Amino acid sequence: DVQALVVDNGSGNVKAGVAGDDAPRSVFPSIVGRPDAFVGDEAQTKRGILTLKYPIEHGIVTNWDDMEKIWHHTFYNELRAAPEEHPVLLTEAPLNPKGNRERMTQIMFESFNVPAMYVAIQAVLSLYSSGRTTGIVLDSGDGVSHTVPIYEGYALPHAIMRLDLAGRDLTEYLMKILHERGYGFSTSAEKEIVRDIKEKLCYIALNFDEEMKTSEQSSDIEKSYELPDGNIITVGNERFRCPEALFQPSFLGKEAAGIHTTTFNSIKKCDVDIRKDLYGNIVLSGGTTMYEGIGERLTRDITTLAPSTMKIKVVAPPERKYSVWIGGSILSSLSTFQQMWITKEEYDESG
Amino acid sequence: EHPEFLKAGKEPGLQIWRVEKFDLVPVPPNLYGDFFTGDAYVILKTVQLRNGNLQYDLHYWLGNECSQDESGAAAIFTVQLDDYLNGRAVQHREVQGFESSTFSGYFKSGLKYKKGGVASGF
Ligand SMILES: Nc1ncnc2c1ncn2[C@@H]1O[C@H](COP(=O)(O)OP(=O)(O)O)[C@@H](O)[C@H]1O
Ligand SMILES: [Ca+2]
Ligand SMILES: [Ca+2]
Ligand SMILES: [Ca+2]
Ligand SMILES: [Mg+2]
């Protein structure tokens, strides 16, 4: 009967909207600024007088007062919805501790008085949005990436991998390597420009060493970008060296495994009898999976790592930037959603 | 509580539902075996075992032109049905033109497709 609200609590941006829409109507940065408080874009608008905090910097909420300000902004400033009059679907990170889930549930029921809610794991929603019940989701967002094997609808928690390596690290790495050309982007505002350069110009090489060799033979690699002040910047091999850090985290000074190795290791944590279904359903999700070339490169790299009798398929849905939110929109629209949620009355008497 | 869940898996046979507007709607039995390319479906095959218990196979069939709400809902309804059947179903994803032999074998006349379908809920 009533329409649910869908809130994807992103490490970088909140995605929010109504159940039944094909995309979130609200997308804003998961930032709170204080000299009360400002949220999102208005808090960036006012960098100069506010101290900014990321209350969900790596996908797990760490500051509940700031997170409540984000949720208030979501309901009141973005959706103009009374939270006490709608069921809410909220997303959580893979491996979110139960105590953190319980705290978000307490806030929703006792600070916002939501009448019913459901908490969903982000990667599971993305898998459903791809039309699958079994597969492994590689979710790469702003402050965190995870690989999440899912079998017959349920994540396998012993096999989930977290990487503290996602889009914000790539933005910072592009800012670093552009110093080779003499650029000195360093301020917050400049970081947002570099993020846009990254999204517009970067791509993933099918074979990094060969791309380095071909790019140095001509200037065909170089592609340009108009800065806010009208000057033009030209970027060459940084276009593919930046997202190469996903595969080679040593470029960032990290000892971590790359995303191909991590995907492989997650599948191997699952029993042999289901691995074929995971290898055949590797589903990309999140903004940091949007690079041109990613599916082809991952296919080549995971095929090399995996047994040769496995059949590797990497699925890169065109709307994968918001697949978490979309999966939540579908789930909370189903005729069965009413039977999934927890009500405030139940919570208040036995929660 | 959903009426079609309450009907699911009670007797040996073949139950087919189409995703329509975020709901699971029975397919008219006259149309069994003919699938709209524009739609997604959930299929429960129930078999009587000699020991007396029932065996369940859940298939979700995705037409080449079905919308994302439909394919997503078919996947979710498959999980929810399996849960309602106490996890005792095996789940199978069936894509138009690449369906398993088991799925094809449920239809004596074989699988056929038809243009069109029910409108997306999105
Ligand atoms: N087209 C693109 N190419 C590469 N990176 C992108 C693209 N679009 C967005 N991103 C990056 O994706 C990240 C945001 O992804 P998102 O999935 O929304 O993260 P989260 O859910 O963690 O907030 C940012 O680092 C952003 O720069
Ligand atoms: Ca191999
Ligand atoms: Ca349809
Ligand atoms: Ca099962
Ligand atoms: Mg995310």
Numbering used by the authors:
A (entry chain A): 5 to 39, 52 to 367
B (entry chain G): 4 to 125
From the paper:
Only after aging the crystals for several months could we obtain data explained by an ADP-only model, termed Mg-ADP-PfActI. Crystals grown after exchanging the nucleotide in solution after complex formation also contained a similar mixed nucleotide state. These findings were corroborated by anomalous difference density maps, in which peaks of >4 σ were found for Pα, Pβ, and Pγ in Mg-ATP/ADP-PfActI but only for Pα and Pβ in the Mg-ADP-PfActI. The Mg-ADP structure does not contain excess electron density or anomalous difference density at this site, despite showing anomalous difference density for the Pα and Pβ atoms of ADP. This suggests that K+ leaves the active site upon Pi release. The twist angles of the mass centers of the SDs (θ) were used as an independent measure and showed angles of 19.0°, 17.9°, and 20.0° for Ca-ATP, Mg-ATP/ADP, and Mg-ADP structures, respectively. In the Mg-ADP structure, only conformations 1b and 2a are present at equal occupancies. Upon ATP hydrolysis in PfActI, Glu73 in the H loop undergoes a conformational shift, whereby the backbone is flipped and the side chain orients toward the ID and interacts with Arg184. In Ca-ATP-PfActI, Arg184 is engaged in a cation-π interaction with Tyr70. This interaction is preserved in the mixed structure but is dissipated in the pure Mg-ADP state, after an interaction transfer of Arg184 from Tyr70 to the flipped backbone carbonyl of Glu73. Despite the mixed nucleotide state, we were unable to locate free Pi anywhere within the structure, even after soaking the Mg-ADP-PfActI crystals in Pi.
With less than 80% sequence identity to their canonical counterparts, actins of these parasites are among the most evolutionarily diverged eukaryotic actins while still retaining most of the core features. Here, we analyze phosphate release rates and high-resolution structures of wild-type and mutant Plasmodium actins in different nucleotide states, bridging the gap between structure and function in understanding the polymerization mechanism and the instability of the parasite microfilaments.
